[PDB]
Design a protein around this nucleic acid. Sequence first.
RNA 1: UUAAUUGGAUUCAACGCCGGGAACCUCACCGGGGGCGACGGCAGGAUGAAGGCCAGGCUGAAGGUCUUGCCGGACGCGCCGAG
Lengths: 45, 50, 102, 115, 123
Amino acid sequence: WKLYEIKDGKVIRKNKFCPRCGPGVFMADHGDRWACGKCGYTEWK
Amino acid sequence: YNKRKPRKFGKGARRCIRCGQYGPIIRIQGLMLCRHCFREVAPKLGFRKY
Amino acid sequence: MQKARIKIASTNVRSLDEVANQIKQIAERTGVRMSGPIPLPTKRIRITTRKSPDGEGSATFDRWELRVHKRLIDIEADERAMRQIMRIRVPEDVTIEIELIS
Amino acid sequence: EFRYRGYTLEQLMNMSLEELARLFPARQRRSLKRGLTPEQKKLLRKIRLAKKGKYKKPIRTHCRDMIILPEMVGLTIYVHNGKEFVPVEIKPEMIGHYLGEFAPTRKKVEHGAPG
Amino acid sequence: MAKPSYVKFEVPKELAEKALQAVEIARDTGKIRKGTNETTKAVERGQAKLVIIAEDVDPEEIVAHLPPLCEEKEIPYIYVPSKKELGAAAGIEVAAASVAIIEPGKARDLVEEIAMKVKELMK
RNA sequence: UUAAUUGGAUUCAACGCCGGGAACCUCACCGGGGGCGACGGCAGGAUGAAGGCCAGGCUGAAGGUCUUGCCGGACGCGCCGAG
């Protein structure tokens, strides 16, 4: 719940959705990259 | 991390069905049984004394 | 000319002789030539093992034997003769394997 | 100067792995050909980029059967003898010998009066 | 008592009871997602059909984001006065901040009814 | 002697013996690394897993440890007994 912000009637997601699995899969905010540990997939920013 | 490693050779790869002894398991055509177990079951397999 | 080769194997001798006898009666009842049952060499499986469970005592060894006898019967082609063999009651110990040879 | 197979260590550095294993005895070359263990290769990476300096950790290993290459010369490695990772210091003559030969896993056996 | 900030309409007691009965029936013979986290995950996926929200949730930010979230995704959301009521209706001993129904089961006849009784509330 | 030569076995009747197999196993020895004790009870609860997992420092490596941050979506640790 803490990873969904809302302004002006639209939902902002604090972290990027991982395309491998689908929606509801946030990403790890490390600054230098976007990482998801479900499979250890990293996309460098 | 609790699984035992695979072994296709050596004593650890082999284990008696009945008692689980890792050691003497005779394999004349594939019995797969401990040697001491064999004594009480040989007649049940049909073996006789001559 | 076409032939059927039948190999009949059993640990029990008497079961094997009964199977051979009824095969003979079938083959002579259908009037089709049969090669007499050739008793092929009997297999003697041998296993020796030390009697004592632990390592104590005199070196004692026990011998265990399995004598399995097999026989060969060759018959000449006749579909009538081959129809009656699948109805032969075969004991649980006797294994019959049949091949067809030209 | 150090000479192995008729060549020096600094000449041994620049040869490829296949020729270098050709210079080796049959057993070590056979083990190299059949493939290093994945832990062997992880440890090879560790020491290789430790030579370049990036890995500043003290290097220790269990790979008693690691075969020392000429390029590894000039380093320190702690090899497990069974209780501790005893150090060994790599010199140019290391080439052609396993690690487990060198760590004492059997201490000295002195003898006294009979019981 | 003052209504929380996220409130956009006043749900009658009877409507809240019907929502609780719908929660129970959808639990019995359907599918419900328990927890505001899973409610958000379902509404974002679009699978949610009706979202029940408690009105005595101490931290507002747990349920602050639900009303505009359901409005934007065009799924009815209804309120119930007590979080413990929603937990009891959800068949769990802990208190459920919100429940998102997925399979109405036998509560469709309520939920669809509740739909207009929710759509009239925002007007 | 050992970090270990695991333990057992004794004159015949222990001593190519338990082992009809001592390179990892065989393990039952030594040193080191990591890890689950079910079920009934207390408490906690999901406001998110207990498992996974990057980047990496420490660990022989192994998300093993640790900062790490997201996850699959759902209840599991400490004790009382007790397996």
